[PDB]
Design a protein around this ligand. Structure first.
Ligand SMILES: Nc1cnc2ccccc2c1
Length: 167
């Protein structure tokens, strides 16, 4: 049993809810929250900006030190950093950004990072401002992630379309 409430069950391991991931993280304090990161860990907008704002910029300060030491992530890659006030850990995952011309085949590699964690609170990778089709992102999630994933969708209209269209 876990603390996640109000989710619709899509598969054995994938759950979905219309929710603000920031407000969900604050309530649950999950072991892992996933950030929709870029390779520079520059958290300016979208999920990254919303989570960073909720940490009072502490996520960005930590991230800048990580990049100064290690250099940029790979598209499809990840790193584990602090969850600050939101979670124990934040898994920063880089999905391909279609608005930068990145290979959408890298979305499966991105979701494979989730398999290193038994339970996660996450957004749909590459969806929203990353420019991918969220329906596609949910299909790749279900077909790639084997661990237990609780997906938060910010848009109510999109949530209803994701559920209604789910095969
Ligand atoms: N409170 C907010 C604001 N913006 C967001 C943008 C993308 C995903 C979630 C968000 C949550």
């Amino acid at each position: 049993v876990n603390s996640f409430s109000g989710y619709l069950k899509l598969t054995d391991n994938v759950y979905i809810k219309n929710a603000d991931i920031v407000e969900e993280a604050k309530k649950v304090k999950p072991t892992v929250v996933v950030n929709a990161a870029n390779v520079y860990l520059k958290h300016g907008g979208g999920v990254a900006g919303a989570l960073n704002k909720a940490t009072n910029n502490a996520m960005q300060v930590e991230s800048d030190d990580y990049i100064a030491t290690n250099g940029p992530l790979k598209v499809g890659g990840s790193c584990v950093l602090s969850g600050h006030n939101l979670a124990k850990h934040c898994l920063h995952v880089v999905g391909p950004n279609v608005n930068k011309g990145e290979d959408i085949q890298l979305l499966k590699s991105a979701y494979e990072n989730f398999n290193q964690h038994e339970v996660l609170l996450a957004p749909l990778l590459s969806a929203g401002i990353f420019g991918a089709d969220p329906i596609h992102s949910l299909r790749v999630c279900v077909d790639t992630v084997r661990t237990n994933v609780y997906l938060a969708v910010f848009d109510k209209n999109l949530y209803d379309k994701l559920v209604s269209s789910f095969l």
